[PDB]
Design a protein around this ligand. Structure first.
Ligand SMILES: *C(=O)/C=C\c1ccc(O)cc1
Length: 125
């Protein structure tokens, strides 16, 4: 080793976020999902690295293989009424870390406009 390595994650989410490069999208963030809860962030506007996968979360259900905090059906009972209604629009909590570099975000989910889905921003706090 010397100055050529990495790990897995060292930010807060992915491409659609606060500020680190910024790209075409919304004005908050997004991870996007599908019917069962499969991440869709993999075909709309790639980040910026050019070498391999966008991240690794691809194909992994945000349900229990990406988020080491969501320990329930999905969010907190806000994806069974917002999905059936056809106008998801709810906020609560979700965090992102609790041992490395903690935080105190406030999540703002909605029935996506970037490509038909049920995203989960993170908001600016
Ligand atoms: C997600 O992490 C939600 C809650 C929670 C509560 C206590 C501790 O220690 C970690 C996480």
């Amino acid at each position: 080793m010397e100055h050529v390595a990495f790990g897995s994650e060292d930010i807060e989410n992915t491409l659609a976020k606060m500020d680190d490069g910024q790209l075409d999208g919304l004005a908050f963030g997004a991870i996007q999902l599908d019917g069962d809860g499969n991440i869709l962030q993999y075909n709309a506007a790639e980040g910026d690295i050019t070498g391999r996968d966008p991240k690794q979360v691809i194909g992994k259900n945000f349900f229990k293989d990406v988020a080491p905090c969501t320990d329930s059906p999905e969010f907190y009972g806000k994806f069974k009424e917002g999905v059936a209604s056809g106008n998801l629009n709810t906020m609560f909590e979700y965090t992102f870390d609790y041992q490395m570099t903690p935080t105190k975000v406030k999540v703002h989910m909605k029935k996506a406009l970037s490509g038909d889905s049920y995203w989960v921003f993170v908001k600016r706090v």
